[PDB]
């Protein structure tokens, strides 16, 4: 069970932004939603509790909502000081525990949105001879600076053996990141294909390689 949040939400100063949090009947369906604000390098802070209530010191610019098995955080009057990662969380009856979403970076646009270019390299024959296999997914040219990378084997999700960087800018003033999937040569050979899927704002880009 996961609570699915977009990697990135963005606007210009003063705009409203609406950050989604998608669950199921056995988490958001059944339980109260909380939102946290985490500024980079700092502890998460409670923003919203019980779906739509604000603790003291939280301005009513921040609003929460819950509908069936999804929830949302709206931020009006967007300003720089809002820039942070935002997490939703609920009790998940299936995990018997509290579950956090993946988090959404909020960016006040300093330039127009730019969609990611994705380059996916298969393992080299040399590496396979060394009894290892690394798929290399290079993601470039995006803004704002946050993505979600998902890997698939024969188009089912693979979570094991994944290492993904944060975004950093290249000289073109757009963000890039890299993600690496580690396999055995036996895994690589035995599947029809592996995929790197990158989600960014309105874009999903999926590149697939085969042995």
């Amino acid at each position: 069970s996961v609570l699915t949040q977009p990697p990135s939400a963005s606007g210009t100063p003063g705009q409203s932004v609406n950050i989604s949090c998608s669950g199921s009947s056995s988490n958001i369906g059944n339980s109260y939603v909380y939102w946290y604000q985490q500024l980079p390098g700092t502890a998460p802070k409670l923003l919203i509790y019980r779906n739509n209530r604000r603790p003291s010191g939280v301005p009513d610019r921040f609003s929460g909502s819950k509908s069936d098995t999804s929830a949302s955080l709206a931020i009006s009057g967007l300003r720089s000081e809002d820039e942070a990662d935002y997490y939703c969380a609920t009790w998940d009856d299936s995990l018997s525990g509290r579950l956090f979403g993946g988090g959404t970076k909020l960016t006040v646009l300093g330039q127009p949105k730019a969609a990611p270019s994705v380059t996916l390299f298969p393992p080299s024959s040399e590496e396979l001879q060394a009894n290892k296999a690394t798929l290399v997914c290079l993601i470039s040219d995006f803004y704002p600076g946050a993505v979600t990378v998902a890997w698939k084997a024969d188009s089912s999700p693979v979570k094991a053996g994944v290492e993904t960087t944060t975004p950093s800018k290249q000289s073109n003033n757009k963000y890039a990141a890299s993600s690496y999937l580690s396999l055995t040569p036996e895994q690589w050979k035995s599947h029809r294909s592996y995929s790197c899927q990158v989600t960014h704002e309105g874009s999903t880009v999926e590149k697939t390689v085969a042995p």
Partner: protein, 227 residues
């Protein structure tokens, strides 16, 4: 007002243990349960479980088995997280916080003290052993690049510590080179890739060589990257 004071940073070898403290400061310790939450560097929050500060009984998330133990010492208003047999993949910041119970409805009692976080404790697990890289060619592919060009590269795998430098054709080739920030893997080793976009027509007659230098291990590798 809740304040939670957490013990400082820890630098640990694989197989060692660590005991992180989370001390309540300026409120009554048994008022609220304490939740533990991990965050690997640059990544999301992971709920580890929580401990009941009245009864003492811990409850663990499914991810977190024998090696992770929550405990209390109510003589000094402190919750602990104890990790044994530390792995490099344990590296991250470990937060404690107060937590709310599950509620039936919104008519139930609420205080803001229900959800207040400590600053977190960074636990770094690393051998800090010097490891040279393995370098592999990333053969040219035209899929992702402009008309009449192809991307090719080198994968520089499993080294420690930073840094690695990469040049192409001994510095003669600089245009369109991108050497990506390294990833710090769950293994505790680094990898990175360097990619360059070149003319497709050149492929059958221009040699491309990445020059990888890992000073810390005194390793130099030059890899020819062929179609």
């Amino acid at each position: 007002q809740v304040h939670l004071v957490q013990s400082g940073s820890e630098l640990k070898k694989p197989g060692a243990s660590v005991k992180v403290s989370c001390k309540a400061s300026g409120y009554s310790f048994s008022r609220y349960g304490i939740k533990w939450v991990r965050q690997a560097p640059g990544q999301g929050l992971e709920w580890m479980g929580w401990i009941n500060t009245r009864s003492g009984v811990p409850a663990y998330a499914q991810g977190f088995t024998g090696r992770f133990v929550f405990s209390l010492d109510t003589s000094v208003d402190t919750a602990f997280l104890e990790i044994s047999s530390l792995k490099t993949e344990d590296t991250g910041i470990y937060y404690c916080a107060t937590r709310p119970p599950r509620f039936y409805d919104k008519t139930e009692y609420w205080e803001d003290g229900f959800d207040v976080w400590g600053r977190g404790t960074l636990v770094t697990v690393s051998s800090a052993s010097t490891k040279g890289p393995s370098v592999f060619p990333l053969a040219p592919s035209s899929k992702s690049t402009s008309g009449g060009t192809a991307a090719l590269g080198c994968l520089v795998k499993d080294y420690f510590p930073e840094p690695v430098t990469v040049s192409w054709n001994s510095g003669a080739l600089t245009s369109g080179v991108h050497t990506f920030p390294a990833v710090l893997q769950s293994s505790g080793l680094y990898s990175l890739s360097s990619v360059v976009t070149v003319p497709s027509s050149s492929l059958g007659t221009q040699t491309y060589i990445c020059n990888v230098n890992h000073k810390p291990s005194n390793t130099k590798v030059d890899k020819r990257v062929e179609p």
